[PDB]
Amino acid sequence: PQITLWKRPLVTIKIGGQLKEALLDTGADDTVIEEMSLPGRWKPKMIGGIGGFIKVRQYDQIIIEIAGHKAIGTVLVGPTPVNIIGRNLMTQIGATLNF
Amino acid sequence: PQITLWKRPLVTIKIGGQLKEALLDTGADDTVIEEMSLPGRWKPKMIGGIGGFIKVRQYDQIIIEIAGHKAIGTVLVGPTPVNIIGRNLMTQIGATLNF
Numbered sequence: 001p002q003i004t005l006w007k008r009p010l011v012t013i014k015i016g017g018q019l020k021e022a023l024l025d026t027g028a029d030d031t032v033i034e035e036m037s038l039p040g041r042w043k044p045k046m047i048g049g050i051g052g053f054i055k056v057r058q059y060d061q062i063i064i065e066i067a068g069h070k071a072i073g074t075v076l077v078g079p080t081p082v083n084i085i086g087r088n089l090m091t092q093i094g095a096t097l098n099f
Numbered sequence: 100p101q102i103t104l105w106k107r108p109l110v111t112i113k114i115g116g117q118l119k120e121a122l123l124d125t126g127a128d129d130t131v132i133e134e135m136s137l138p139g140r141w142k143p144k145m146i147g148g149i150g151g152f153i154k155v156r157q158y159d160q161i162i163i164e165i166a167g168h169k170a171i172g173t174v175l176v177g178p179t180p181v182n183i184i185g186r187n188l189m190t191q192i193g194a195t196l197n198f
């Protein structure tokens with residue numbers, strides 16, 4: 001699709017067997033999702049921006065379906081105010097910014 | 100252009116005759132610039148980011164060039180990790196996400 005930016009670019013994702021809404025965010029290096037369980041090992045990470053930093057759990061090799069497209073990569077899990085699909089996964093679905 | 104997301108989508112902007120680097124951020128509703136002098140009056144605004152809500156200064160109807168495209172609109176000034184070009188100005192220059 002071609003998505004305009006008059007409103008937040010929200011899409012449906014499937015992660016961990018769960019359907020969620022998430023923001024396509026070109027300003028985010030990595031994908032961060034609200035608290036949920038994911039399989040495998042994790043390590044702590046700090047990520048920050050407006051308003052400061054939050055602590056998250058970094059899970060690697062996680063499969064997500066993003067508006068119908070499958071991708072694999074790192075997913076951060078923690079107290080993010082919104083679910084964010086970052087560049088690390090948007091590249092895998094071929095997402096680009098065009099103007 | 101067509102900007103891929105393997106790297107941060109950093110572009111040059113021009114505001115008040117000065118060149119600056121900024122991030123094209125589809126996850127940002129608003130445009131936020133590092134401390135600088137802008138003309139006119141400002142009004143208060145609260146914005147939320149990954150770490151919580153902050154106060155910023157809101158300046159309206161500010162002329163800004165973004166990767167050589169002219170925009171005129173609201174610019175927020177405050178504590179920000181990077182200069183952020185948000186959806187309010189990305190819409191003006193015709194930017195869309197495509198996959």
Ligand SMILES: CC(C)CN(C[C@@H](O)[C@H](Cc1ccccc1)NC(=O)O[C@H]1CCOC1)S(=O)(=O)c1ccc(N)cc1
Nearest residue numbers: 027028029030047048049050081126127128129148149
């Ligand atoms: C600030 C940029 C440089 C980085 N953030 C992404 C931004 O898109 C961020 C996303 C967001 C939307 C709404 C609520 C909370 C966060 N929007 C944001 O702050 O919008 C503000 C600035 C003006 O308009 C409003 S981040 O969330 O800190 C982040 C950092 C690291 C990773 N791996 C993932 C996310």
